[PDB]
Amino acid sequence: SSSIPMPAGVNPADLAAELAAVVTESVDEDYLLYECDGQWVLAAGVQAMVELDSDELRVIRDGVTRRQQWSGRPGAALGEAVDRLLLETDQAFGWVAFEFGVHRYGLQQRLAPHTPLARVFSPRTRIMVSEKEIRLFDAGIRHREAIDRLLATGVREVPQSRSVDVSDDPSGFRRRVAVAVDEIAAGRYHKVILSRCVEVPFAIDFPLTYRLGRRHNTPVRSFLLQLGGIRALGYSPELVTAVRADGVVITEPLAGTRDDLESNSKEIVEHAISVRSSLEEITDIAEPGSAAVIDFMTVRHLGSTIRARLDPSSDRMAALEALFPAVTASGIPKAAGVEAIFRLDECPRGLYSGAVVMLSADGGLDAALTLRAAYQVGGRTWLRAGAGIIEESEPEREFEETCEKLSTLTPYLVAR
């Protein structure tokens, strides 16, 4: 490591995002910026890439692709490969698709071939930005020069945003909600989350947009990425899993949102069910006795925090797998909710309702639930937002709730 104190009057998110823009202009490299506990970590460059797909795992280093057959749990396959990366570097970063959480409910055979489950990479360089300092790991000369240039000029002003209409319902979200409700009435499941996609008809600047949104959102984690043809940014509302080096496993389910919240029976029940659900799953991977709800049904939303100690027969990937996908983005019971999503949502979800991850050689894992994000693939730019569906839900109300959820990003999109 090296370091260079943070200039006063400069916000770490803005600076980290600018650095992402700057390094991109000069070196034209892939990156992932992850915000975690006051540290904005820019993982710059891909030294080695792990691609996990439904049919194959690939490790790509220096343009050389090494393909792998895998069977069993996706977590084991991802885990084995990632552990290898972590022999050479301290951290690895990436995203996990929603579809990583399909084998667990037996739904894998429904995936098309070459369906992406995770992309995890070890970076060439790491730059960490906190209010206190800027830390450099394995920064070469262009990277050093790039930081210097940024520090020398300081951040660009964010241009004004360009609006998008989210009123159109091309995917029949209203119709699909109606269908889900009938099934719920019919006892197929209690809850399911469904979503819609709102195309953005103009290109956006991802780093400038991420900065604008960040000012106006307060998330558990945030991310900006340019990774393998995918561009994305997001302020994750929820922590799916964290594993500490000492083996403490944390998960933080949230079933609150829109006093009345703390007393509302519907919200209370919905929450209690997730907490109980998280506990059971965490129980699968936990040292016997260790699992506890340390904060319960506290309003933050309504959130609880569940703790456990990872069992020695178990590992970080298995813990993520056990907790995947999050209830908040699937439904109850989880197997039925997931199956319903396959039928009733536009798949494959990919990054939506998945996780963005940071892993460490010390056994660390940090996984954040991906909602409130924007994406660019191909020439396609879009947003995705969803709602929880229960027997009582009405489609028009649900449509507006997605609208509300999309207003986290809609006012803040900078073009280019």
Ligand SMILES: CC(C)/C=C(\Oc1cccc(C(=O)O)c1O)C(=O)O
């Ligand atoms: C913290 C978080 C889990 C709580 C909420 O947020 C969401 C839940 C499900 C889908 C989305 C979405 O944006 O598509 C979402 O934002 C909530 O409204 O309950």
